[PDB]
Structures are given as C-alpha cells and as structure tokens.
Design a protein around this ligand. Sequence first.
Ligand SMILES: CCCCC[C@H](CC(=O)NO)C(=O)N[C@H](C(=O)N1CCC[C@H]1CO)C(C)C
Ligand SMILES: [Zn+2]
Ligand SMILES: [Zn+2]
Ligand SMILES: [Zn+2]
Ligand SMILES: [Zn+2]
Ligand SMILES: [Zn+2]
Length: 180
Amino acid sequence: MEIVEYPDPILRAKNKRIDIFDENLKNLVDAMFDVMYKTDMIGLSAPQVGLNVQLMVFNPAGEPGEGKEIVLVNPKIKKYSDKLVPFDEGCLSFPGIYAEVVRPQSVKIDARDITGERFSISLSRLPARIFQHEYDHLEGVLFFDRMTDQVLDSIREELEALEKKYEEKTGLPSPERVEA
Ligand SMILES: CCCCC[C@H](CC(=O)NO)C(=O)N[C@H](C(=O)N1CCC[C@H]1CO)C(C)C
Ligand SMILES: [Zn+2]
Ligand SMILES: [Zn+2]
Ligand SMILES: [Zn+2]
Ligand SMILES: [Zn+2]
Ligand SMILES: [Zn+2]
C-alpha cells in the first residue's frame, strides 16, 4: 500500500461509515496493523492508507506481541474530560514533524468492533492520546490544527516544505497552505 501524506486532499475529505463487516474489513485492519508496525507507529487511521472510511487501529505498547491490538469502527466521542494535558506528537502523514499538542486527558467512547457489535469504553493516559489523534483523522482534522500559534509557528517551514513537494509532483498549487 501507499502512505498518504500532507497536504494530500484525502486527509481532509469526509469519511464514510463502514456498514459491511466482512473478510475484506478483517484483511484491511490486518494490513493497517502491518503498516503501523513497519513504519514504527503506535496507531493508524484509514485515510492515511488512501481509504476514506471511519476505521482506526492502535497498540499503545507499539511492539509486536505486546500490549493490545485495539480496533474501532465508526466511533464517536461521547465526552471529553475537562482536564487538558500536553504531550509531544508525531504523524505518519507529516514525515519528521514533532510538536506539542494539548488534548483532554480522558475520553468516553462508543464504537463497533471487527464484526459490528456496538460497545462503549472509556480511555485515559496514552491510549486516550492515540485515540484522539486518530479520531481527529477520521474527521479530516490534522494535528497542527490543534497546536497553539506559538507551536505552529515553529513548524511552518516544515509544513511549507511538504507543500512544495506536493506541488513538485503534481505541478498544481498546494490544495492547502498553512499561510492561509
Ligand atoms: C501520540 C499520538 C498518537 C500518534 C499516532 C502517530 C501515527 C498516526 O499518525 N496515526 O494517525 C504516531 O505513531 N506518531 C508517534 C508519536 O506521536 N509517539 C511515539 C510514542 C511517543 C509519541 C511521541 O511523544 C511517533 C512514531 C511519531
Ligand atoms: Zn498481516
Ligand atoms: Zn499483522
Ligand atoms: Zn519502535
Ligand atoms: Zn517538547
Ligand atoms: Zn496521524
């Protein structure tokens, strides 16, 4: 598969809810985990692999045979804690960019598993961190949108650089610019 990187429009387009839970969804999740493991990430969302569907995966442990392989489909955040905590984040769609993002420390969720059964779960610490980053993804939201002006100002060039790449390869004007 091929990894979708900023400022590709795929990461912004609305994503469709998954209504079919077959072996092709089982295989996609599997593949999504392999991409995650091979790229040394701890999570991954559908758009990042070129598929605009409401599907994500993550393993807090970040290592094969450790932690727990967690998968959520069509999730929805029922509540964000009032407490906001800072934490440094990276993103497979923005090769090389690391920064601080303030996010609520915990969260309550509603979602479906690899088969369709509706369920709820509450998250905290790192698991909550990963989920929110991915959930943002499922909603066309990228991590710099969450950063403060101060923090964004420190990655503008890296973002602009990426924008210059999209243009070099497509001869067209960057679909989105961080100048705007
Ligand atoms: C923590 C928020 C969840 C980040 C998920 C991203 C991968 C992802 O892009 N999902 O959409 C990741 O693995 N980035 C990692 C990341 O942000 N990490 C690795 C563990 C520590 C933390 C950085 O403080 C690294 C590999 C760049
Ligand atoms: Zn596999
Ligand atoms: Zn695997
Ligand atoms: Zn690693
Ligand atoms: Zn720092
Ligand atoms: Zn990401």
